[model samples]
Target: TCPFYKKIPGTGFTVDAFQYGVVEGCTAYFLTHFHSDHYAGLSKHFTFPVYCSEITGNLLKNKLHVQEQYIHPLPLDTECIVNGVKVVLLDANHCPGAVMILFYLPNGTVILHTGDFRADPSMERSLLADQKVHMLYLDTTYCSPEYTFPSQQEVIRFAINTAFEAVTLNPHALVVCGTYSIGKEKVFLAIADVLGSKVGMSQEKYKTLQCLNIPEINSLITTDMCSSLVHLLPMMQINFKGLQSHLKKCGGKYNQILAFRPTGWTHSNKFTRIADVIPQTKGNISIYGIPYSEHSSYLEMKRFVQWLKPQKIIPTVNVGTWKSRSTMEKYFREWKLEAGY
Candidate 1:
């Protein structure tokens, strides 16, 4: 049997905004999630109307320090037409604000961009019941033969254990960490839920709690900038340096207060790095996270792709030019050829 190379036909761009700029008459850019890789760069250059989910838009506006005027917030699965193209937001199941954008034209042509999604079987079936998609821009980051990931719930449980161990081991130490402001709330919630009536966060986290309105949590404290909500829960807020001074002043009444930053949990170089400018004391914890990544596992990716079974599959990130040009050959070799497809 003689086989030859064939060229693909569709025109697609990567995470690069410039390529998106070059796509003649490409009007609006739909941000599937607010992660820096998928959103930050594009926001700076592309002056077009940008679409994002309401929660993510609020996050980008309030927490991430982006302008609200340029953003158009839409609810999930609500179809909106812009420049004669139909767009719908589908559940990504990767993170709190993540989503998959499905773009369609009047002529029945559909494009599904899987923006960092996962196959959460418990919820995926009902979530993706719309129809068979024509084009799939998938999140195939872990589509290799040698990569695997634990369940997301398992990862969350392990993370809670690690945080608990860190806190309980050092009862009198101040714990500081870094994480995405949006997702860090989950970590904070998890920690507080475990710590129960003894946990307090900084003013920054308190602001997040207020804006996001996380209930089912009490005993959460911010600094002096707190509202009456803190009274209901064990709330306190100490300014950045004031926190240190308050602990020292009170002989460390707040000594055990922890500051956290979410970073580098995604198994990529773009993971958060703590800045050296901040004073690193024994209380300052520069944690690089245990073995955890927010992306889908190989099995999940395989299952989702097979389940969705879109006609065309594409993938992109914050750094590529045109959907990582080599994805099809690579994933096809791994999934189709190796799996006897």
Candidate 2:
């Protein structure tokens, strides 16, 4: 994750800082989202007043134990006057509570700071249609040209079809789909709700799930481990060694195991479809490293930039070193040339 440029170049605010201590122009603290990388520096006793989305504020208060007085829930479209400047939040489409913050300064300039998000066609309509952007602090997690994985819809479809076969072959297998705190919920919900058995998740997920109550999903989730065939586990547990050991650890109730390690590591350029890469298997565990990312791909980022064509781009990720930062900027350097820079 990018740590540099936490302090906005010409603003009286700091966007996601805890490591970099107080310096010039650190008056208002703005946390774009609840992702650990973005909000890493929040100390035992937070000094600054944090501004974020409503759910993100709740998360900060409850999970991180930050005080209510310091947490300010920024509603979408509603401007809050901070330091004589207009500030607002929009749906960022990364995690549930993630937001894209905007700063409308007194000089009639706009600074759009987009946290971690996947760019969809819908975002252009809802997230940024009329919003005039002077500078965009982009989430360039997958900024390299090498990472153009298939869309989320395609991967979800593939995972659904693939799991349909796996469960049929091994009926007694404990189906495991890896997840982040917010995303990859669809991987298990769509897969397990239809093809497999009852879904299981951690207490944290269950607690977080309480915030977003889909009508049907209410009945699908269960807390117990042994009863459910499909379980949502953290990405750390998706490894072959861990799965194999856990397969034995779960007792003989489960005959085999199927694990889907959905992450952004789909680096092979030859993969025409997700099925092109065969599932890696050893013992009874079959691990599929599916290309499932909440962050924008290189092409997705490119499209957004081409559409927005902001005055300047400020990278929010992979900006620790100049080489990485410049490498990410190379494509945009030429893209703006076509878009009338």
Candidate 3:
């Protein structure tokens, strides 16, 4: 979950930061994304050369106010050498600037760090097409069979159409769609384009969107909530009590508020019984949790690991203790016996 990096004994190359402090003993550093958890100790007060995607670089400067002199932009699919280690950046398809880092070490070993990615079919061509890898740092967020959600595009369509239907039922009502700050821009953009209207965002969210620099997306959002019937907000704010309070503050401007939380957790019936497009209403607020995930499902992870067949599989998360590590190791051993060649 935090601080994943590999070090070559004699070389000075370091990967991502390892602790809540600055990472030392490295000539160059690689940042996978701008997710707050990934960048624990990084701040404006710190001065160190950090390499990441162009979008991530821009966001770090504008959002976190990290100084420009220390940020370096790494292009996707372009090979570069840092401290005698060959490296390349590949699209992670997780967030706006997320990337899967490929490191060809000087010790004749290849390491691939999948920085929180969706294992969609497209990866068959991009990252999983007969690639040589010795070690794989996997993103096992939903590494269980219960997370059998649909594809991202289908879930996005479902969330959008459900919101549209809710709005059409009562034009006087306002629809609030909840999402992460940066990852789910596509959902809002699609909802706006489909509804033939603009989406409203807070000043802070709008600033992050502006850094993305996509003309089509930038043209469809506004800081003014009155400009559109739909209001996009952070996922945590879509709860019933919060929306109720929000509706009260509007002073009867809208008769009802429909809150939608688009996430993959809705698909796990063992966890919750919420279904797609099914609205659970309480008082003047109706809440629905739709399935929209950027991480791979358990089956997808199995297929990916099978395809790569790396000698060593180190999960980027849950490696802190002996219990967690042993459980994962046993799980992988059984998985290999059942699925591996």
TM agreement with the true structure for every prediction: 0.66, 0.90, 0.90
What are the per-residue Cα lDDT tens digits for candidate 2 across 1-341? 32446655556787877556665657778887777766877854886778888878777877778888888787787768876677778887787788888778777888888878888777788646877788888889888877878877888888888888877887777788887766667778888866746688878887777655357766788888777888887888888887877778678888788788777755564455676766788877788878877888788888988998898888877777889977977877888887876
Q: Model 1 — which ten-residue stretch has the worst lDDT?
A: 1-10
- TM-score, cand. 3: 0.90
Tens digit of per-residue lDDT, candidate 1, span 117-231: 7656643555356676777666666665455545545545755665567667765544433444345355545654565433444556556555443454444555542221111
Backbone clashes, candidate 2: 1
Local lDDT at 43 for model 3: 72
lDDT of each: 0.53, 0.78, 0.75
Kindly report which residue pairs in candidate 3 clash with one another: 1-317
Query: How many steric overlaps does candidate 3 have?
Result: 1
The CA lDDT at 5 in model 2 is 61
